[PDB]
Amino acid sequence: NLFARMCLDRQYLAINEISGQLDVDLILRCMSDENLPYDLRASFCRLML
């Protein structure tokens, strides 16, 4: 949640280095993985957005 609120409204100063760890594939795999509770998946959704 802190990352998602940190990267709001075109903030490249955080996006440029946070995105280096969480690529689209990893976030999307966290999307599909139903084992995790839905709140973590929602946090992943907002982070990817």
């Binding site: 949640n1 802190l2 609120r5």
Partner: protein
Amino acid sequence: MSSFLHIGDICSLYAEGSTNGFISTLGLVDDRCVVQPEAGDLNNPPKKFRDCLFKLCPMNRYSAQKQFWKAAKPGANSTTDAVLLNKLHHAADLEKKQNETENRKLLGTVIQYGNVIQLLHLKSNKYLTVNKRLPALLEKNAMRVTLDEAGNEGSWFYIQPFYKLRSIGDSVVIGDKVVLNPVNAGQPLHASSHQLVDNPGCNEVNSVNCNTSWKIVLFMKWSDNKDDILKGGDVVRLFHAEQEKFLTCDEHRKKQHVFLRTTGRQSATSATSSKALWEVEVVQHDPCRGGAGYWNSLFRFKHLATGHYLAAEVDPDFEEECLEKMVYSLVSVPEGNDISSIFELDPTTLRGGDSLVPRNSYVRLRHLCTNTWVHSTNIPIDKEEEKPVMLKIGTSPLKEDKEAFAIVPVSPAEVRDLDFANDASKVLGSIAGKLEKGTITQNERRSVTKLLEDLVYFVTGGTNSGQDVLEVVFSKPNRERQKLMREQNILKQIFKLLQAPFTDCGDGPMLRLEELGDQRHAPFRHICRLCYRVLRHSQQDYRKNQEYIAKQFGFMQKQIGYDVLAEDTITALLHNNRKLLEKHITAAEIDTFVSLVRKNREPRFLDYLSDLCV
């Protein structure tokens, strides 16, 4: 000539005998009666004379109120009473309305010896009561004389003659010496000689058999106590008409300068400050009589905050400038018995000389001693200041209609609130000073806790009803009371008190932050929680208070996590505030939050620094 006493008259009581002096009160937060002998006498009234005034009232019915009060406490648990809660609460309200109706109807009637009366303290709006079940403080076998807001059966008094000249059934004459006997106590009100330890010169007043007589000194007639008429003892603001500024007196360069403050506010009459309040006084032959206001009377203006008197005197600086006009300039003098402090009042329309002065009429001020007229000057008082806000005021022998003032009345409730704020600030400062050394007692803790509860109810604008004070929710709080709490240094004393227990003076702090989890510090946790509650209530939906509090953000960060309710206050401050979060946040606060996460890892710190960047 003299005359009889009447219901509704305002008068003071002068003790005479073993100890002589006017009966007064210590303050709004304290409920003790005091006779001060060295303040003055009949020929020289005390400087703070408006404290010593009482109002004559008839009996009040307290039966239904007694039934409601005497067991409103929790003592039983069934399920068969709420209907009569509502029923006899309505009954008590009806009784209050009936009391007010009979009080209005009976107003003006003559008081005779043997009648039963109640004394209402005008400054506090509290009745004078005697408690027969409680002993006196400094005396053992006396009774306790205090002040109660609503009164009770102890408020009733017999008015009885101290002289064999008068007899029961005779009307009471102004200047008579009487004896005040409570209905339910039977012991005359006694002006003891037991000096109060904490206030020097204060002598306790209690109920015991004695020979003390109370000389009734009139101050205002029942017919002259009209709200729609200017009268002595009122509080007003002298608002300049054309300049659109308020006449204030403020300290500068170790001296008091009276000036016309350059109010930058768009609204002229919105500038509500405690230093712009003036005490109107009508000059009379009797030093202890106030009277009403007439167009041809003589007036004095007294600064409410400092007590100084407004006067015009031969200016010492510009007189030297006259040899290198404005002959005299207004100043504030400490003494008010001189002839240089007296003023003449001039109407702005065709009003008869003998007519009463309307409450909020424009006027012109003429200095009687020099026969000059007041005038507004554009010369700044503070020359060295880059943005002057203090404009000099002088007087000129030439009269003109441009220079006029407005007598803006101030409601008594606002004055009561201001005095309550002053007293609360004083007692909070004293408590903080005592607590930073760790030499307090249990009664002081009770006093400060009930003071903080009263502060909560004062700022929130509500009334006590038995509901919890910590978890109470109100509507939009009173605005002017928030302004008062900011201006009267209540917030400063709250911060000092919050820093007090943990302050170190060379021997170590008297309390430890992580030690608050014990059961032995429950009252201290309660005090801290009440302090943070008043902070949160004060900062709500107000810009100036939020800006004032945000300066102490670095102080109030490091107390989070100890269940002192700093969480709610800090969250409210960061939530509904946008610009302050921009200009009072630096790397220090972020680093502090990061460290607090590192040492005491818990998600709510992460939420705290998450929601302050969005």
